[PDB]
Amino acid sequence: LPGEVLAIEGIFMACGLNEPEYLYHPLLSPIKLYITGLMRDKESLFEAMLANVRFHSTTGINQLGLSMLQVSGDGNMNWGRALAILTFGSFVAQKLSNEPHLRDFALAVLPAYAYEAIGPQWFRARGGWRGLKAYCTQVL
Amino acid sequence: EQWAREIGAQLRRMADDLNAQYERR
Ligand SMILES: [Br-]
Ligand SMILES: [Br-]
Ligand SMILES: [Br-]
């Protein structure tokens, strides 16, 4: 495994930018396949979120990062919230792909926001990516 | 003008449905 923030960026690359990873990973590759399915099925809800939100800017990407932190503002985390955060970041990446500079700022900051939003200690104390995959196979 | 919390609540609601699937017997 590459490191949490790095792995999340890869998830945004594979799921948001639809950039097929060249090598298969036992844990991350199925997770990426699950998040893509979540984007497809819940596209309408993600569109509703960002409907009247002006996020195509560095200021907007900052607020998108704040949006991730708002998920766990009550101090609670589960793999459901973790998936919503990771899928939301991927969806954001997809909408910024045709704007190189904004896309790259998103890739630069949002992986760290998603990781913090989940909670680094909670992530590690619940099995990390193995725990997430197990949750995915059971729910999706 | 701020819209981060509303998105946070909508992500929470989306997570609720996933957790409902996890808890389904
Ligand atoms: Br915009
Ligand atoms: Br741009
Ligand atoms: Br598994």
Residue numbers in the entry:
A (entry chain A): 6 to 145
B (entry chain B): 131 to 155
Paste lines from the article.
Kaposi sarcoma herpes virus (KSHV), a member of the gammaherpesvirinae, has been shown to encode for KsBcl-2, a potent inhibitor of Bcl-2 mediated apoptosis. KsBcl-2 acts by directly engaging host pro-apoptotic Bcl-2 proteins including Bak, Bax and Bok, the BH3-only proteins; Bim, Bid, Bik, Hrk, Noxa and Puma. We also show KsBcl-2 adopts a globular conserved monomeric Bcl-2-fold structure similar to other characterized herpes virus encoded Bcl-2 homologs and binds BH3 motif peptides using the canonical Bcl-2 ligand binding groove. KsBcl-2 lacks any significant shared sequence identity with mammalian Bcl-2 proteins though it does contain a recognizable “NWGR” sequence motif in the BH1 region, which is crucial for pro-survival function of majority of Bcl-2 family proteins.
To establish the structural basis for BH3 ligand engagement by KsBcl-2 we then determined the crystal structure of KsBcl-2 complexes with two of the identified high affinity interactors, Bid and Puma BH3. The KsBcl-2:Bid complex was refined to 1.41 Å, whereas the KsBcl-2:Puma complex was refined to 2.11 Å. Clear and continuous electron density was observed for KsBcl-2 residues 1–146 and Bid residues 79–104 in the KsBcl-2: Bid BH3 complex, as well as KsBcl-2 residues 1–146 and Puma residues 130–155 in the KsBcl-2: Puma BH3 complex. Similarly, in the KsBcl-2: Puma BH3 complex Puma residues I137, L141, M144 and L148 protrude into the four hydrophobic pockets and an extra hydrophobic pocket is occupied by Puma residue W133. Additionally, an ionic interaction is formed by R142PUMA and D79KsBcl-2. However, the expected ionic interaction between pro-survival Bcl-2 proteins and pro-apoptotic BH3 motif ligands between a conserved arginine in the BH1 motif and aspartate of the BH3-motif was surprisingly absent. Additional hydrogen bonds are found between Q132PUMA and Q68KsBcl-2, R142PUMA and V76KsBcl-2, N149PUMA and N83KsBcl-2 as well as between N149BID and Y140KsBcl-2. However, this highly conserved interaction was not seen or is very weak in the KsBcl-2: Puma complex where the closest proximity for this interaction is 5.6 Å. In place of this interaction an alternative salt bridge is observed between D79 KsBcl-2 and R142Puma. Mcl-1:Puma features the hallmark interaction between the conserved Arg residue of the NWGR motif and the well conserved Asp residue of BH3 motif, whereas in KsBcl-2:Puma the NWGR motif is present but this hallmark interaction with the conserved Asp from the BH3 motif is absent.
